[PDB]
Design an enzyme around this catalytic site. Structure first.
Site, PDB file in Angstrom:
ATOM      1  N   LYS B  53       6.518 -10.123   5.961  1.00 53.57           N
ATOM      2  CA  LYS B  53       7.568  -9.138   6.138  1.00 53.57           C
ATOM      3  C   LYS B  53       8.716  -9.720   6.969  1.00 53.57           C
ATOM      4  CE  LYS B  53       4.276  -5.473   5.118  1.00 53.57           C
ATOM      5  NZ  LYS B  53       3.285  -4.529   5.708  1.00 53.57           N
ATOM      6  N   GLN B  97       1.585  -1.631  10.719  1.00 53.77           N
ATOM      7  CA  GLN B  97       0.750  -2.351   9.764  1.00 53.77           C
ATOM      8  C   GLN B  97      -0.617  -1.669   9.673  1.00 53.77           C
ATOM      9  OE1 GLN B  97       1.694  -4.593   8.069  1.00 53.77           O
ATOM     10  NE2 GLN B  97      -0.254  -4.990   7.000  1.00 53.77           N
ATOM     11  N   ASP B 120       8.052   2.469   5.445  1.00 54.68           N
ATOM     12  CA  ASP B 120       6.877   2.440   4.585  1.00 54.68           C
ATOM     13  C   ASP B 120       6.803   3.714   3.743  1.00 54.68           C
ATOM     14  OD1 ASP B 120       5.368   0.125   4.164  1.00 54.68           O
ATOM     15  OD2 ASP B 120       4.131   0.377   6.010  1.00 54.68           O
TER      16      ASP B 120
HETATM   17  O1  LIG Z   1       2.355  -8.748   2.376  1.00 53.32           O
HETATM   18  C1  LIG Z   1       2.011  -8.397   1.228  1.00 53.32           C
HETATM   19  C2  LIG Z   1       1.888  -9.448   0.165  1.00 53.32           C
HETATM   20  C3  LIG Z   1       3.068 -10.108  -0.201  1.00 53.32           C
HETATM   21  C4  LIG Z   1       3.051 -11.081  -1.208  1.00 53.32           C
HETATM   22  C5  LIG Z   1       1.849 -11.377  -1.826  1.00 53.32           C
HETATM   23  C6  LIG Z   1       0.660 -10.743  -1.495  1.00 53.32           C
HETATM   24  C7  LIG Z   1       0.654  -9.761  -0.477  1.00 53.32           C
HETATM   25  C8  LIG Z   1      -0.552 -11.202  -2.282  1.00 53.32           C
HETATM   26  S1  LIG Z   1       0.139 -12.466  -3.405  1.00 53.32           S
HETATM   27  O2  LIG Z   1       0.352 -12.103  -4.836  1.00 53.32           O
HETATM   28  O3  LIG Z   1      -0.359 -13.774  -2.976  1.00 53.32           O
HETATM   29  N1  LIG Z   1       1.703 -12.306  -2.807  1.00 53.32           N
HETATM   30  N2  LIG Z   1       1.763  -7.099   0.921  1.00 53.32           N
HETATM   31  C9  LIG Z   1       1.352  -6.537  -0.381  1.00 53.32           C
HETATM   32  C10 LIG Z   1      -0.095  -6.059  -0.190  1.00 53.32           C
HETATM   33  C11 LIG Z   1      -0.323  -5.352   1.145  1.00 53.32           C
HETATM   34  N3  LIG Z   1      -1.506  -4.644   1.280  1.00 53.32           N
HETATM   35  C12 LIG Z   1      -1.711  -3.974   2.475  1.00 53.32           C
HETATM   36  C13 LIG Z   1      -2.956  -3.247   2.685  1.00 53.32           C
HETATM   37  C14 LIG Z   1      -3.082  -2.365   3.787  1.00 53.32           C
HETATM   38  C15 LIG Z   1      -4.311  -1.692   4.005  1.00 53.32           C
HETATM   39  C16 LIG Z   1      -5.398  -1.930   3.133  1.00 53.32           C
HETATM   40  C17 LIG Z   1      -5.241  -2.837   2.041  1.00 53.32           C
HETATM   41  C18 LIG Z   1      -4.028  -3.517   1.805  1.00 53.32           C
HETATM   42  N4  LIG Z   1      -0.880  -3.970   3.479  1.00 53.32           N
HETATM   43  C19 LIG Z   1       0.324  -4.672   3.409  1.00 53.32           C
HETATM   44  O4  LIG Z   1       1.093  -4.687   4.365  1.00 53.32           O
HETATM   45  C20 LIG Z   1       0.579  -5.394   2.164  1.00 53.32           C
HETATM   46  C21 LIG Z   1       1.863  -6.150   2.033  1.00 53.32           C
END
Ligand SMILES: O=C(c1ccc2c(c1)CS(=O)(=O)N2)N1CCc2[nH]c(-c3ccccc3)nc(=O)c2C1
Ligand SMILES: O=C(c1ccc2c(c1)CS(=O)(=O)N2)N1CCc2[nH]c(-c3ccccc3)nc(=O)c2C1
Lengths: 294, 289
Positions: B53, B97, B120
């Protein structure tokens, strides 16, 4: 043929519960519950509807009054009334009949009503709360629909459900209730849900309905749901309230006569969901009166 | 075979749009936007995501501080921290987060972030506004999924969509955006949508998916979607992020049947982050309330 489900009867039961719960609340020496209704202008259905809600409160021992206003009225005005009532500790539930005139902004009126008196559950916080599966003042018609289903013993968990229509105060909350976790603060139906609307292609609608254990129509379209759309044994709930002529009368969205001979259950229009709606309003008012939620 | 949509490329595009909007906005003499992130405990993925982020912030000229704390924090401490940030007119967007430690009430927290700084979109007022099709701060993964679809050029009106998952911050909001009226303040997809979840038996999944012009999978389950579930030519969007890291779909296989598809990694993930930047500039601009 299909078990036909009496919303008239079911609603009367429910009001009996409410009568008793109110009887109890008063006999413990709490104040008798008061519902206020604001009605603007002169839609004749609208009139009918307040009348319905005024009767219901009478039946169940809830004090009522309907504040009538001319369509001439302004938004700023209406907000002042609503503001009067939010502060009158005598008023437990406050409900604004719809629709309002085009020069008044519905959303702003709906969010004016105090959430703790919001017996329609249309305030943004109640919507938010409902969509997050938390305790809330549930809206009456969707809650009605759910009561029909739950009191008739028709299962939902695992089941395929189609809701046609997506109004913010009928279709969407129905779909929200029915698809959500039975385990959250406000249990939902754990069904698999399909939302249809004015841009579903009739063939695609039919394609989804045909797979449906429960079909719930809130489109406001006669003969939308015909027996060729319905799986054998299915439950069919008719939320439609459609004003045609044949003398001027009222129909659902279901081909009652057709579908009745294919379906495992069905609701009539008249005397299905409409009165269940007024019933749940009475439920919400007692709840409001007990200051249970927020 | 199936066009693979680049999450990475689209996220690059959106980030560029935001970089430009931020420069104009600063150049007109406004304060440079600031985003604060609260981190709690020491989840590997939490830490990685927070960095993902703040990385994107710096790339698009938004200031950031990732405030990292110990699991052992008291909930009332946190509420007090958030009230600080809510009050610091220098913070434009604040995001907490997830997930937090079992001993703290997410909902109480999520609802404690100022709606106006709630990049968010998880505050009850933002969920409310979204579900009523009003203007609102959209949640980032849902908005990401949508942009991927609108940008790739895939139609939605009249079409048949299915969404596996009903999480309040991914699946449900996706299903909300896709079925609602294009005419509304916050327009939606006008699609026909089916929401499946953990009580949908595979039989039933497949029976719906196969009629699906677009299948959006957000269930958090390896391989859930196989090519027999998909209708040849359809668009498939893999919102899964699962640590074995791969998706909810079967990539190689599905790829041959599908018309469109998104990888994992490099799919929705990066888009999620892009949309957060969009939301931070919206916040900075105080358009909404
Ligand atoms: O930060 C990322 C992110 C960015 C890019 C990316 C991935 C993840 C996997 S990837 O395809 O390798 N590329 N995210 C998307 C998923 C993601 N998931 C959760 C989350 C929170 C609670 C429980 C499960 C997941 N919190 C987050 O805050 C984020 C922010
Ligand atoms: O008060 C009733 C009612 C009672 C009994 C009854 C019917 C309706 C139709 S019936 O099946 O013939 N029996 N309702 C249900 C329908 C109803 N519909 C609307 C309404 C207005 C605009 C848009 C959507 C719904 N506002 C309302 O306030 C009510 C109250």
């Amino acid at each position: 043929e299909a078990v036909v489900i009496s919303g008239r009867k079911l609603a009367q039961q429910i009001k009996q519960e409410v009568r008793q719960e109110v009887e109890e609340w008063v006999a413990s020496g709490n104040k008798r519950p008061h519902l206020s209704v604001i009605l603007v202008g002169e839609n004749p259905a609208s009139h009918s509807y307040v009348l319905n809600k005024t009767r219901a409160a009478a039946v169940v021992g809830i004090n009522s009054e309907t504040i009538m206003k001319p369509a001439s009225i302004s938004e700023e005005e209406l907000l002042n009334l609503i503001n009067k009532l939010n502060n009158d500790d005598n008023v437990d539930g406050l409900l604004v009949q719809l629709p309002l005139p085009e020069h008044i902004d519905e959303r702003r009126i709906c969010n004016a009503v105090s959430p703790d008196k919001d017996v329609d559950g249309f305030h943004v916080i109640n919507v938010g709360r409902m969509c997050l599966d938390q305790y809330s003042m549930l809206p009456a018609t969707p809650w009605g629909v759910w009561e029909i289903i739950k009191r008739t013993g028709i299962p939902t968990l695992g089941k395929n459900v189609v809701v046609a229509g997506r109004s913010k105060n009928v279709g969407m909350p129905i779909a929200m209730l029915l698809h959500t976790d039975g385990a959250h603060e406000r249990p939902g139906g754990d069904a698999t849900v399909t939302i249809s609307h004015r841009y579903t292609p009739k063939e695609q609608l039919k394609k989804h309905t045909i797979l449906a254990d429960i079909v719930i129509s809130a489109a406001g379209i006669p003969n939308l749901i015909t027996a060729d759309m319905i799986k054998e044994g299915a439950a069919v709930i008719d939320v439609g309230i459609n004003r045609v002529h044949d003398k001027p009368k009222l129909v659902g969205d279901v081909d009652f006569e057709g579908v009745r001979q294919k379906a495992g259950y069905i609701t009539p229009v008249p005397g299905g969901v409409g009165p269940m709606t007024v019933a749940m309003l009475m439920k919400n008012t007692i709840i409001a009166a007990k200051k249970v939620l927020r």
